Amino acid sequence: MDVVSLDKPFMYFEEIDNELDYELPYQGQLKLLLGELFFLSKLQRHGILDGATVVYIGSAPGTHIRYLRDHFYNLGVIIKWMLIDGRHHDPILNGLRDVTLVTRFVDEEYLRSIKKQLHPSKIILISDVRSEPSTADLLSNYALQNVMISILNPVASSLKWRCPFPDQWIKDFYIPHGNKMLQPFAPSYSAEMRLLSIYTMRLTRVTKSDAVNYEKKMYYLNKIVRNKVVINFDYPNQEYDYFHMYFMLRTVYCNKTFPTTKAKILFLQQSIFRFLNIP
Numbered sequence: 001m002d003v004v005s006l007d008k009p010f011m012y013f014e015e016i017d018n019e020l021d022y023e024l025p026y027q028g029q030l031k032l033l034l035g036e037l038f039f040l041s042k043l044q045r046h047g048i049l050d051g052a053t054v055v056y057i058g059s060a061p062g063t064h065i066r067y068l069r070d071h072f073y074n075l076g077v078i079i080k081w082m083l084i085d086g087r088h089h090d091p092i093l094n095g096l097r098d099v100t101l102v103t104r105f106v107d108e109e110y111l112r113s114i115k116k117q118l119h120p121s122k123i124i125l126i127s128d129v130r131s132e133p134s135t136a137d138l139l140s141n142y143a144l145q146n147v148m149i150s151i152l153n154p155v156a157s158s159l160k161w162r163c164p165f166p167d168q169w170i171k172d173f174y175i176p177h178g179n180k181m182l183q184p185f186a187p188s189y190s191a192e193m194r195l196l197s198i199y200t201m202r203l204t205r206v207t208k209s210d211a212v213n214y215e216k217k218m219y220y221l222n223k224i225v226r227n228k229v230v231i232n233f234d235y236p237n238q239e240y241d242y243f244h245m246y247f248m249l250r251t252v253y254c255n256k257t258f259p260t261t262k263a264k265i266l267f268l269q270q271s272i273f274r275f276l277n278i279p
């Protein structure tokens with residue numbers, strides 16, 4: 001891995017500054033865990049996480065969700081979880097009074113009913129629904145996610161967001177405004193990000209040129225940037241994905257006090273890796 005000296009990783013898609021012509025055990029739960037720890041910790045910093053209800057759609061099996069709860073439960077943050085998926089969840093999510101497990105595929109009619117029963121409590125939406133997928137599969141998925149937002153009207157949302165490839169384009173479509181969070185420990189050449197939005201919902205047109213810009217920017221990220229060793233980075237592992245993870249984890253709150261910031265991140269990573277069974 002070519003060596004590089006960095007002050008900070010790319011945290012959002014907008015920060016990628018170059019492009020290139022495209023050509024771990026249970027790493028997926030680690031990717032989801034970090035991005036949802038990042039998203040929800042940002043909400044905690046804005047003081048809006050607390051007293052909210054997290055509605056997670058497409059949450060199965062959702063092993064990592066157990067860590068997310070226990071984290072905020074041990075911080076004393078009052079959160080109710082509603083996990084809705086047609087597939088069965090990981091049994092490790094059983095027996096938690098503040099976690100509601102719902103076995104159901106969501107449609108417009110059912111989003112209306114859960115809004116009725118949760119209203120007027122703050123809703124935080126996390127969607128990871130997926131129906132390899134075609135561009136029509138994605139367009140329907142993103143349509144459904146817009147429908148989640150227009151009905152549930154969450155105070156914030158994290159949405160699965162991967163632009164359709166330019167050579168499989170169909171039509172321009174619309175997605176919410178928000179910050180496109182980059183995911184460490186994503187698959188080697190995935191172009192998926194998490195659309196993070198805090199609502200104070202204006203839709204944005206996505207064009208075939210955007211798809212080209214996504215494809216080239218994310219390829220440069222996956223081919224060049226993520227294959228670097230950050231030699232100035234004071235950490236047991238200096239591979240970029242760990243440098244990236246380190247900057248996400250420093251936004252996380254802990255009840256425990258640590259002598260240094262590096263000590264905190266090391267503790268959190270050990271905790272996350274141990275629960276996810278990662279050496």
Ligand SMILES: Nc1ncnc2c1c(C#Cc1cnc3ccccc3c1)cn2[C@@H]1O[C@H](CSCC[C@H](N)C(=O)O)[C@@H](O)[C@H]1O
Pocket residue numbers: 032057058059060061062063064065084085086087104105106107128129130131
């Ligand atoms: N509507 C929904 N509501 C809830 N969950 C849904 C869906 C859905 C769909 C659909 C669909 C497909 N064709 C249609 C055709 C016509 C009309 C309507 C149609 C709807 C998929 N999912 C779940 O998304 C997860 C992705 S992996 C998450 C992994 C998870 N993030 C983790 O922690 O591991 C899977 O578990 C999957 O079961």
